[PDB]
Every structure is written in C-alpha cells, then in structure tokens.
Design a protein around this ligand. Structure first.
Ligand code: FAD
Ligand code: FAD
Ligand code: UDP
Lengths: 391, 392
C-alpha cells in the first residue's frame, strides 16, 4: 500500500490533520496509533452494566470562541446545549465555583454585592498586582485573593501537580473565569456543548474517509523505518510525547499522569452534578465524575449510576503522560527539544504537534485550531506545491 | 382599508397571535382595538432614557416553551438569544441558589447533602404533617417541603405576594412543591427559551406588521363597537379584555392581585450581578428586584450605570392593572356566572373570550400563544373559512 502522509497518534490533532489531507487534497493517509483505541484522551465508551457513556480519561468538555473551529467540528457531530458547571467540595460543603458572587457569598458567609465583592477581593489580593505576577501562585492570589486561594486553589493544585505553586505557569489559573456576577459557567467561550453521539463517534467520523487508514496497537518507533522506506516522499506529523521521540536525549520533561477508579453504584444519582472537585488534602482524588449527567436525553438506568474517581501523580518512565508541567527547569529542557524538533523537520520532514508533541497545555479546541493552521499554512503547501517545511 | 372580517380587542400576545393568523393564513382583514397607547399588553418593552437599557415596565418578561410548534411560530417574528433564566433568593442577609435544590439545601442546612441524603432529609421534615390532613396553604407547604424550607423561603414571600397570612390561604393553592435533588438551577424546565434579540416590542410589532392588520390605539372597544359592528355586521369579535367589565360587572367583580414597580437608575455598572433577586424576608416591602442589563449581556450597555426595578404586590383596587387572579371560592362562583353569560354571548353576538383577562386565568406568553393557536385551529379559522359554528 502507498501513502502520501504518515500521522502518529489518533487524537484530535492527528485526526484533524488526517481528515484535512484526505478530503481537501485527496491524499492517502496512514494513521499509526499505539493504543488499542482511537481518539487519544478524548476516547469514550459505554460502561457495560449501565450502558452509560464514559469518558475513559475523565470528563471532556468541548468549548471554543473560534467560529472557524466551531464550523469545522460541526461537520462531524452535532452538539447538545450543555454548558459546563463545576462545584467545589471544601470542608464538607459544596460551593458554587469558580470565582463569582456565589463562591464569595458562600465562603464569607453573607451576600456581597458586585461592588462589595470587588472591594473585598482587592484588599485580599493586595500583596501583588495581576500585571506583576510571575507565577501561578502570584497570579491566582492576585485574582481571587489569599483566603479563597488557600481554600480552593492551594491544595487542589498540590494534589494535581505536586509541584511548588511558585514554579507553575501563571497561565494555568487564567484557564478559569474570574467574575463579579452570579454567573458560574466553568468556561467563558462563545460555543460549547457535548457531542450528541459521543466523542468516539465524532472521532471515527473524522477518520471515515476511505483514503484514511488507521492502525491501532502499533508503535510508530517499531514500524517507521520500513514504512518510510516504502513511501520516502511522505512527510510525518508526530503527536506523541516530544521527549520520547528523541529517546529522552535532552533530559526528561516533567509530566503528570492520572489513574482512575470507575465504580457502578446502586443509586440513580451519586452527586447531582457531572463534576465535583475535591479541594481538601484529606481525600486522595482531585475530583469525581458522574457521567449520566452529561446526557439526560439518553436511555440511562434510573436505579444505577457510574462514577469515576480521578487521581494524579508523576508520569514515570512506564506511564503515558497527560499534562505538561512546565516548571522553569522543564522550560529549559523544552528549549532543547524544540531545537531537536526543528532539526528533524528540516532533515526528516517530521512535523510536531498537539499537547504531547509540543509539550503544551492544550484543550481540544486549541489542538484542532493548531492542526487546521498547520495544515493550511505548512503541510498542504508541502504536499501539493512541494513547498519547504522550513518556513 | 376597512371592510373588516374580524375584530380583535386587545393587542397582547393572545390578540396579536389571533390577528396575525387570520390575516396571513386566511387573508382576512382585521381591526385590532387597543385601549392603551401602545401594543403588546404587559409584554411591552422600552428603553430607559438615561441608560438606554431595555426595560419591561409592566413587569419582567422571560420567554420559555416546551412546544416546538409554538417555538417555530414565534421565531418567524424574532430571533432569540441563548439566555437561560436563573433566579437567586435573599434570606437573612445571604444569597441562595434557587429554586430549592441541592445548592440551596446545602447552603441552608450548613453542609453538602447528596441526592439521596437530601431526599431523606426532606422526606423526614415533610412528614411532620400528612398532606391529606393539611388544613391550609401553610400546612400543605410544610407537608411537601418541610418546616425549615417553608419558613425560610416560602412563608413570608407568599405573605408579601398575597398580603395575607399563609395560614389563611387554601391548601388548594398548591399543586406541587418540588425540591430538586440535583444542582440544576436553570429556573425553567422548558426546552426552548431566550430573550428576543431586538426586544419584545419589536417582536410584537412584527406580529402586527401584515397590511391586512389595522391597529387602533388609545381606543376603548366599548366606545366604538356599536357603529363598527353595524358597518361590519358578520365579523366575529375576539375579546381579550376583562370578562366582568364586559358584562358591566353584573355578576360581581373578579378579584385580582396587581404589582407596583419602582424603576431606579444607579451610579454603578452592576447592582446585584444577576437579573432577578427574590427577597424572602418581611423586613423589605418588595418581593423582587430586577436588574435589566443582565437580561441582555450581549448588548453594549453603559459601564458605569444600571437600572433596577423594585416589585411590590397587593390587591388590585379599581384603578389598578389586574395581573394575577386571586381565585377565592367567591371568585370562582362569580367566574361561573360570567362563563355562562359568555357562552350566551358567543351564540347571540359571535364574541369569543380569550387571553388572561378574558378568561380570568394567569397565562405566560407561550401559554397565551398556544391558547390562541388552539382557538384559531378549532374555532375561529373554521368559522372564518367555512362558516362553522363558534359554539363548541
Ligand atoms: C485528563 C485530561 C482531561 C482533559 N479534559 C479536556 C476538556 O475538558 N476539554 C477539552 O477541550 N480538552 C480536554 N483535554 C485535552 C484532550 O484530551 C487532548 O489533549 C486534546 O484533544 C489534544 O489532542 P492531541 O491529539 O494533541 O493529543 P492526544 O489526545 O494525547 O493524542 C495523542 C495520540 O498520540 C498517541 N501516541 C503517542 N505515542 C505514540 C506512538 N509512539 N506511536 C503511535 N501513537 C502514539 C497516543 O496514544 C495518543 O492517542 C484533557 C486531557 C487530559 C489528559
Ligand atoms: C407582571 C406580569 C409579568 C409577566 N411575566 C411573564 C414572564 O416572565 N414570562 C411569560 O411568558 N409571561 C409573562 N406574563 C404574561 C404575558 O404578559 C402574556 O403576554 C400575557 O398574559 C398574554 O395574555 P393576553 O395577551 O391575553 O394579555 P394582555 O397582555 O394583558 O393583553 C390584553 C390587552 O387587552 C387590552 N384591553 C383590555 N381591555 C380593553 C378594551 N376595553 N378595549 C381595548 N383594549 C383592551 C389591554 O390594554 C391589553 O393590551 C406576565 C404578565 C404580567 C401581567
Ligand atoms: O477547583 C479547582 C480547579 C482548578 N484549580 C487550578 O486550576 C488549574 C486548571 O484547572 P482545570 O479545571 O482547567 O484543570 P484540568 O481539567 O485541565 O485538569 C488546576 O490545575 C489547578 O491548579 C484549582 O486550584 N482548584
């Protein structure tokens, strides 16, 4: 078989690339996936007992303000009207979350108006200006104030990262909306929803073109030399972990990984909301997912439910990495791997993309936007005009 | 102009649904007679001068429906925003998630209650009174949600709404009083909702737009009907004004509650961070405060000013606008008498009675529109198109 393009990894970055090359240029694409399933961390599957669709790697919520991405993804799936909301469990109480008049009134024990809340938080955040903040801890404190930081941010962050907050990226906290209204949407984007027929169906729709071949249970590094030899003109888009690609030659990047405990309970409803964060040090998990709440429109049992406890730890050499940590030390090692990546692009026509491929904290919509850009601006001209990958 | 096929009295959503359907679906000429200086009844909206913020001066209007036919119908006249209504409740100086659900329950009882423990808690508290033995509104409420939640969020709010001790209100007043056993605080349960993108008045004007519809404002039907009907004798009348006034209050006066509003512009960009705040306590005279900028987040409103509207409830005296039917036993008897008079009037004078005022029934917008579409399909359109009897 002949191929015009190799894609390593079948997550949203890889499949966006594969779909674009196949449909927009008529190219033959081989997608190589080491896991037994498609879709990267966005993969979903039914829990056998209940038939409830489970997100295998914990809740995945789609949201974007990029209309071009919204138009693109709607070609492969419809979306529900779901809007994500998260509650935070702290000292035995469930709190409205994230930062907003709900959290403020609950935590400080009486109603604060928008102007009263702004004044309160300003005093409590005064040790640092959001302008000046050098790191996660400083930025977080500057936005929500020290008391709310100590209660809802500090120990959740310790569990999720096991890394000094002063050495975590400031951009980690700005993922969360900061409001002085009673709005408690977890995201602040124009479009959001869940795929009506689930994530796995969406992903399979992206790989549906007959010019796309997907090989699961296959490690690129075991098969690449013979594949490339048989198709030497084909470039490669790699979306596996960046340090692993170069056999950790420049050091090991710090990654976090997750373990899950899935449980079917003999009640119809465990927590009354899709995601409950556990912000205290006294429980091992960071949050519990209850998946029935994502799809009320489905034929789900009324006397059973599936929940999933999420636990975070360091990615060892055995594990598969889920989160880039990006300490200052990580960033120096990153700079070395970026030099290696650019060299491999020039020498071996290998492009690097995605959360793992670029060591970036990317959501689905970010990964898809990035892949659309790579295709239009870099890969398509190489594939169809023989333009250089060295732009 | 003229040569009217149909008279419609009142230009609220019920009357305008009737007029628009008769005009566009049957090609009939309609005269809409409206005693107010504007169309739309209480759904009429307008800009507050100082801020430019769109307000609903007859009361806050939130649109919602679970009927797809009604949804598809109203979308011919307006687009809708993605607004979802949510309400918060102020009690003893704290803001609560509302309606009663796991959020409120956790806040009020001082710790997290799971769906199962909340269910057990409410069942235990509700068991103080058997619902069958409930002798009034207060006992029935307690028998459904338990004494703490009743006394915190229902008792005094109800007292301010009806200006009456809930002990003196009938158990009949209460159909269901659910506590939600999830954290869902979307106020309405309906499938479709949103605010009209260009506001209610523009939506209403679009319903009245067909050239076969003529509208006469500042005009009382009873001043003009005799000569109008003489000139157009077989045009039926769809009357959506007060049922008792129609018959000169001959069977008594139907009891209604009214609302007073106080509109105020404040020198802050945001007064309460949410569209509607209920005030559950006896220590403030208003039931609710509306902040209209939050009805339309998508608009560019002033960053340093806001308009709020305090709402007050009381019995509607003779010069007051009637809002909600009281429905005492005496009222229901007065209503039965007028219902008989109305049926006789439909037979002898071809007058149909409809809408909130014409039927002594509170109707939401989508209820009124659904009711008018039903009257049209079942009664008025077969009459206008085939000469079918209006008596059913
Ligand atoms: C716990 C977690 C929760 C998340 N929640 C959200 C959310 O709520 N909303 C949102 O928008 N995004 C969320 N994301 C991000 C999302 O899962 C993806 O990271 C995002 O879609 C980016 O996709 P990707 O293709 O870049 O990477 P990936 O999804 O990781 O796909 C990379 C693929 O490369 C494969 N691969 C790796 N090495 C090899 C190799 N040698 N050979 C062959 N194949 C290989 C991997 O098996 C993997 O399938 C979450 C991610 C994680 C880990
Ligand atoms: C405070 C208040 C708040 C409301 N909030 C909501 C909400 O949040 N969501 C929702 O869906 N609905 C709400 N509604 C209901 C909404 O107003 C509906 O559009 C209305 O009930 C529709 O019924 P209608 O058209 O028959 O009533 P109306 O809107 O009252 O129309 C009746 C019309 O008949 C006119 N009229 C009366 N007598 C005469 C006469 N002799 N001659 C000529 N004209 C006459 C009246 O001036 C009026 O314009 C609210 C209603 C009120 C009063
Ligand atoms: O209850 C919470 C939620 C988030 N965060 C911080 O915000 C970061 C991003 O939160 P997100 O909800 O985006 O994390 P993900 O779902 O990507 O694991 C986390 O890593 C934490 O450091 C926190 O401290 N407490």
């Amino acid at each position: 078989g002949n191929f015009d393009l190799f894609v390593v990894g079948s997550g949203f970055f890889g499949l966006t690339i594969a779909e674009r090359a196949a449909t927009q240029l008529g190219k033959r694409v081989l997608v190589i996936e080491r896991r037994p399933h498609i879709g990267g961390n966005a993969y979903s599957e039914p829990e056998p007992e209940t038939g409830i669709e489970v997100h295998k790697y914990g809740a995945h919520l789609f949201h974007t303000s990029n209309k071009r991405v919204w138009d693109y993804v709607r070609q492969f799936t419809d979306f529900t009207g779901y809007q994500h909301r998260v509650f935070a469990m702290h000292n035995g109480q469930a709190y409205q979350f994230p930062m907003g008049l709900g959290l403020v009134s609950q935590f400080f024990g009486r109603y604060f108006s928008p102007d009263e809340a702004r004044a309160l938080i300003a005093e409590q955040a005064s040790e640092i200006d959001t302008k000046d903040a050098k790191n996660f801890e400083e930025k977080a404190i500057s936005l929500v104030g020290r008391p709310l930081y100590e209660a809802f941010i500090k120990h959740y962050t310790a569990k999720q990262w096991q890394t000094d907050p002063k050495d975590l990226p400031a951009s980690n906290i700005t993922r969360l909306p900061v409001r002085y209204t009673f709005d408690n949407r977890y995201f602040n984007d124009t479009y959001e929803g869940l795929p009506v027929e689930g994530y796995t169906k969406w992903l399979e729709n992206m790989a549906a073109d007959e010019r796309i071949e997907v090989r699961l249970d296959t490690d690129w590094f075991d098969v690449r030399d013979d594949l490339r030899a048989a198709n030497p003109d084909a470039p490669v888009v790699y979306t596996g972990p960046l340090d692993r690609y170069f056999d950790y030659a420049e050091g090991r990047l710090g990654w976090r990984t997750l373990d899950f405990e899935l449980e079917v309970l003999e009640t119809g409803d465990f927590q009354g909301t899709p995601v409950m964060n556990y912000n205290d040090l006294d429980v091992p998990y960071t949050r519990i997912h209850e998946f029935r709440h994502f799809h009320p429109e489905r034929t789900y049992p009324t006397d059973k439910t599936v929940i999933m406890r999420e636990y975070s730890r360091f990615a060892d050499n055995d594990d598969e990495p889920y989160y880039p940590i990006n300490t200052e030390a990580d960033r120096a090692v990153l700079a070395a791997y970026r030099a290696r990546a650019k060299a491999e692009t020039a020498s071996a026509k290998v492009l690097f993309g995605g959360r793992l491929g670029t060591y970036q904290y990317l959501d689905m919509h970010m990964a898809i936007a990035s892949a659309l850009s790579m295709f239009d601006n870099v890969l398509a001209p190489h594939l169809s005009e023989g333009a250089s990958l060295v732009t």
